[PDB]
């Protein structure tokens, strides 16, 4: 139908405007420690400890079979980067200062990127 073209048309969109949010967000992490998946054989334990794993690239995966239906679906996602973090490491680590680092400078992106998913609809 035409009106499934033009659902399809809308989500293409999204996924256009989603694509260039993760690039932003992903140059808060200049270190890329949230580029790639924890890895299991390098942290064994770490199922035992944050029940669902997120990084930028499992987000890049599901962007790109657009499997974002709206911006709140993949703040999910970037929240649960920052917050697994948050939780896995103490404190006093590089990698809890660097979740708080993009957690600060990635809420400024996202305020604007809200206004325009609403905007565009």
Request: aromatic share 8%.
């Amino acid at each position: 139908s035409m009106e499934q073209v033009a659902m399809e048309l809308r989500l293409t969109e999204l996924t256009r405007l989603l694509r260039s949010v993760l690039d932003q967000l992903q140059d808060k992490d200049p270190a890329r420690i949230f580029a790639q998946p924890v890895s299991l054989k390098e942290v064994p334990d770490y199922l035992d400890h944050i029940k669902h794993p997120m990084d930028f690239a499992t987000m890049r995966k599901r962007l790109e079979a657009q499997g974002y239906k709206n911006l709140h679906e993949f703040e999910e996602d970037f929240d649960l980067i920052i917050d697994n973090c948050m939780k896995y490491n103490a404190r006093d680590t590089v990698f809890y200062r660097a979740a708080v680092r993009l957690r600060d400078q990635g809420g400024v992106v996202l305020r604007q990127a809200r206004r325009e998913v609403d905007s565009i609809g």
